[PDB]
Symmetry: D2
Subunit: 248 residues, 4 copies
């Protein structure tokens, strides 16, 4: 079990990628701290991890709140005694509008969850990791941390910002045994995306050279790698899992 004896935190873990990451961490022997805004979805992730022989607890948190982030890390350390791994995954897509039409409130919402909340998580995670000898952070970015998503300027700007924060943490903590890397998924099959029409879906698929959407499990494999000791010389990096989207 590649994460035996480690304590890992996953934000936004009630569904999608966050769920798959939590399951992967659980399967590899980490004690997992699940966090999400939705308690029923969070408790379900815990049940699923336990049913597969893992260990997990849930802590409700608004990832945009500094205080909630601090309390989440505090809860992990109280419950399991340390924090080794954090996957900063909580994120929203935001409204769709051209930049000039983008609402002020809708902008703020996306920036506060997708970017400021990642910083607040990192800040308090770092504090715990420095106390317990170091640790590993995986920030969830997106293809849109390097290429535009028309009608989604806030999302693109926020995910770019997560890449910059990542480089900064990796550079600053290189000799303090904290590694930090960012993952950039392409479009991944969600229920949301089933809600999208079928012409929008085919248009999305056409933009992936591999000729399909990704699965949450495939993103979680790369997160697991970057969370483990296998990636010991990797820090400050951005790693695409996009089916070739950004290669063209």
């Amino acid at each position: 079990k590649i994460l035996a004896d480690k304590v890992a935190l996953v934000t936004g873990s009630g569904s999608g990628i966050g769920l798959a990451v939590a399951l992967a961490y659980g399967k590899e022997g980490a004690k997992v701290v699940i966090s999400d805004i939705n308690e029923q979805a969070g408790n379900e992730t815990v049940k699923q991890i336990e049913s597969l022989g893992g260990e997990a607890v849930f802590f409700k948190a608004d990832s945009s709140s500094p205080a909630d982030n601090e309390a989440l890390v505090g809860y992990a350390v109280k419950t399991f005694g340390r924090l080794d791994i954090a996957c900063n995954n909580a994120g929203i897509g935001g409204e769709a509008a051209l930049t000039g039409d983008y609402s002020l409130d809708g902008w703020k919402k996306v920036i506060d969850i997708n970017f400021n909340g990642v910083f607040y998580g990192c800040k308090y995670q770092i504090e715990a990791m420095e106390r317990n000898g170091g640790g590993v952070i995986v920030n969830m970015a997106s293809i849109h941390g390097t290429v535009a998503a028309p009608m989604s300027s806030a999302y693109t700007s926020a995910k770019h910002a997560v890449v910059g924060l990542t480089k900064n943490i990796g550079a600053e903590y290189g000799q303090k045994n904290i590694r930090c890397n960012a993952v950039g998924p392409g479009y991944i099959d969600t229920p949301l995306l089933a809600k999208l029409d079928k012409e929008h879906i085919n248009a999305l698929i056409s933009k992936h050279p591999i000729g399909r959407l990704g699965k949450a499990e495939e993103v979680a494999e790369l997160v697991l790698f970057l969370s483990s000791d296998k990636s010991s010389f990797m820090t400050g990096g951005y790693y695409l899992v996009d089916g070739g989207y950004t290669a063209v």
Copy 2:
């Protein structure tokens, strides 16, 4: 004069790069709206432009405020009839602290000015430009839109965001005649350990810091018709800093 009859706005144009940009715009025939949080500096830029025979007005604004950004553009269009060019330059360096030690208030201040404020500027600039058949935006980013600045995580994060916003605007408004590009300066001579200065210079293969005027030349090019096929791009002016 390559910007003759164009109306141009520059935020944070009381000093440094923003001043150099405003002087470049003024010298090439634009009507220039100067904005800065500091009235004395801003008024001084106007005078220097006027002294060279250009046209310029000052409007005091806090670039972190949506309302001030909207009022700045509104003032440009009221004063001169239209908005053709905008350079989003206003920004702060912020506190120096490791990410884990970065204060909550200091983080918010840097993000609000350097990230959110550029968006608020772009938003209202775009709105005005679309009324007049289009325009050109230059966002001021930094080398730290692509590489780390240890002790300045908020600045680095915000400058990365500016690059992303730029890509989005350029991609979205390609067929609506609004171009948007970002400039990435290296370290520029502005008014500090000798050892710190020498460490900075050692990181620039060209072997010296840049001058504000050298940054402004690229901004000017990107603001003119000469750059007509360039949009959504990030353009370094860094003495080789990011090449190594």
Copy 3:
């Protein structure tokens, strides 16, 4: 005239981008050395520059030959006394085939012209520039120095290589007053492209957010900027002129 008293060299200047660059240099008061494989096309560029009040000479060269590159630079220095500016523009598109199907001879041809020939030009240009106090090189890359061109692996690989060579020269000669930058055009209207069918052309246009192909003149503006003293703090850089192609 922003290039008054400068001596500039443009390879592949008999047509397209190379032609537009030569005209721009000529208009801005440079003494221009035109080089191309085709002498009628080269002499025509000279005539055009002269007709607009400029000064120019032609020297036939195979840009893939080290000896021809050395002789070209030698001719510039003999004719006009120095070399200040070089635009390395000679290039072929190559055959279209998947990588696994790409011919060995067709690979070699594209690598030798588009990449090795750029190095041979740079080498001999640098030698002259160091003698006359420094200089400025513009290497012509392409969008395909950063993103894939399916069916054109040799072209993509070569243009990537030109970007790396550029960074290397800029880094090495930073304190020796030689600047080197690369330009990355998107798809530009040529006669070739008129030869392409109309569905291929529309497909190309759809990949440019600006919603048209570029013009050779628009590429030449950026080359002119990067050749001039206006770009004095820019070196080792790659600068896109692609209508937004690489932004998405």
Copy 4:
């Protein structure tokens, strides 16, 4: 074992990263074809894999030669029936010289091995993989696939080319079940001024050189089914070198 029953080739697997990759492949159940210009080193890798209970054969090849690359793949398919995985690792550092001083022969040698030879490998690997329903390629690039290495222009140019080739293969064969990704190592401990060594280490924020085994772990991941949605990508393993 995550590569059980897979057939894998590694060029330049007599030493350094290539050896570490071959050992990783062997330990995870692959049948491994070792290739190197040096028979003694290559045969030694085979023995170390065998000693661990893996399966491996050696084939001597000059990675700059199209014919040798074709014969290496042909040997893998003849020996084991198929080719599933290839790691293109063989490369040289080349002469140390400023671009303007770089010898014509030394330039050609580096480009032929580090650029052309990777293509010749990929070409024949692709051909074999398509016969057996697909496969996975990992090209070994370097940090110098994105940033300069002063005095090593040929190496930097070639490593950039490898990144480009990788993007192309990944984009072209997306629906043909061939994935291709590139790995970008920082400086790795291999058998030289102390001052030169300390200068190298100072350029890695992690504060040390990497180990070959740490590079091989990323290659292994990218060669396995775990990386099933990853293609056309460039993946750094650099202790933060390119982050600053």
